[PDB]
């Protein structure tokens, strides 16, 4: 089989920037008689299946914005985006159809935007979850940039790093921001032995942390 290779793994540009992505093949994909290179470019947005953008190295699929153009021939190909938009966020895989088929590792296109402070939210366990021996306190740090951030819990002024898991979403295709949930899971028991539950979020956005807490069912 023919091996394809793509680098860099990532790429970050600001909306409107011109970006190029390289893809190389282990052997010529060129048809000597037609000068046609059997190389295609696939784009896959988060949650969606890959979609063919370009084929034959430089032939744009119908309906594909013209800011997308591919070049190269033989074993060296390039996919160019004249004015990267927010919706262009995705992984662009290159594939050869010269001999069977082979996908490249793909290059991730990330969007660079103006820094943004996350909107935090703290949620106490539902009565339902407790009614099974579970105490999960969730924290929602929504729509921020960059991705880097700090989230620590403080059970009664004390910091907790045990029993907590974080999850970041993919970058948004509209505002290009990030979101992340931090959950603290304690047993229905271990949860009642305390009353103060706080979520500390320290984003580069500000120097003063965003503290959202609650006292055991104070209500």
């Amino acid at each position: 089989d023919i091996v394809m290779t793509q680098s860099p793994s990532s790429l970050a540009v600001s909306v409107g920037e011109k970006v190029t992505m390289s893809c190389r093949s282990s052997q010529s994909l060129l048809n000597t008689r037609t000068r046609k290179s059997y190389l295609a470019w696939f784009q896959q947005k988060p949650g969606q299946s890959p979609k063919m953008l370009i084929y034959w190295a430089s032939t744009r699929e119908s309906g594909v914005p013209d800011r997308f153009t591919g070049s190269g021939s033989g074993t060296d190909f390039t996919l160019t985006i004249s004015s990267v938009q927010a919706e262009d966020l995705a992984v662009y895989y290159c594939k050869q159809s010269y001999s069977l088929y082979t996908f490249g590792g793909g290059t991730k296109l990330e969007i660079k935007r103006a820094d943004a402070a996350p909107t935090v939210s703290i949620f106490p366990p539902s009565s339902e979850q407790l009614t099974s021996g579970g105490a999960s306190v969730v924290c929602f740090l929504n729509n921020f940039y960059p991705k880097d951030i700090n989230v620590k819990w403080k059970i009664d002024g004390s910091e907790r790093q045990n029993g907590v898991l974080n999850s970041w979403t993919d970058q948004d295709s509209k505002d290009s921001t990030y979101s992340m949930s931090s959950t603290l899971t304690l047993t229905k028991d271990e949860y009642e032995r305390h009353n103060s539950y706080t979520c500390e979020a320290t984003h580069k956005t500000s120097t003063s942390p965003i503290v959202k807490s609650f006292n055991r069912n104070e209500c």
Binding site: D1, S121, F123, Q129, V138, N142, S179, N217
Partner: protein, 214 residues
């Protein structure tokens, strides 16, 4: 519009066998060479097999040659993929793909989880306020296996202000969250409810967010 709907996927024990199927529609399926492409959880795309328009020919990547078998039924207009000695590394989203420029299209894919773990439906918990301008509700979908789990709010009406975070594997069990924001005016005046779904367990559950207690 053209349509490629694959099915038969799901959880399968290692060394096991599975027969993937794909329903073609919207085009003359029998006039095209169809392929099966798969995506690893690591997001790597891998071409697994292709069968000629008339089915008289099949092609596989040296590697997949043997455990994978592509076949088609032009009368039924469906594409098939037989996998044997299913290893863990064969865990991936399997797509039904058409590579011809005139009919370039891929299905939404069918997930295949090769693990010994067991199917456990999710537990849906509402994330209500606590104790403003906008209200951000949540919905904890915990303790399920395998993937995936689709979460929508108010029958999807509320598209967007929605954030469904990726799951986290803890003791052969996935758990994810999903936020959703609406002006403070709407809820609780107007109701908000998350519609969770877990295919592997055929679990369909709805959880309305109630203003806690008090």
């Amino acid at each position: 519009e053209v349509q490629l709907v694959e099915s038969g996927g799901g959880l399968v024990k290692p060394g096991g066998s599975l027969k993937l199927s794909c329903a073609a529609s919207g085009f003359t399926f029998s006039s095209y060479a169809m392929s099966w492409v798969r995506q690893s959880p690591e997001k790597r795309l891998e071409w697994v097999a292709e069968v000629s328009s008339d089915g008289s020919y099949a092609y596989y990547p040296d590697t997949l040659t043997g455990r994978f078998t592509i076949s088609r039924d032009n009368a039924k207009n469906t594409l098939y993929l037989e996998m044997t000695s299913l290893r863990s590394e064969d865990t991936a989203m399997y797509y039904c793909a058409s590579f011809n420029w005139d009919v370039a299209y891929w299905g939404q894919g069918t997930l295949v989880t090769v693990s010994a773990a067991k199917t456990t439906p999710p537990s849906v918990y509402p994330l209500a306020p606590g104790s403003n301008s906008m209200v951000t509700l949540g919905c904890l979908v915990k303790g399920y296996f395998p993937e995936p789990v689709t979460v929508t709010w108010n029958s999807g009406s509320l598209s967007s202000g929605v954030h469904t975070f990726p799951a986290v594997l803890q003791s052969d069990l996935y758990t994810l969250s999903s936020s959703v924001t609406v002006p403070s005016s709407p809820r609780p005046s107007e109701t908000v409810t998350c519609n969770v779904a877990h295919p592997a367990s055929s679990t369909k559950v709805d959880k309305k967010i109630v203003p806690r207690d008090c």
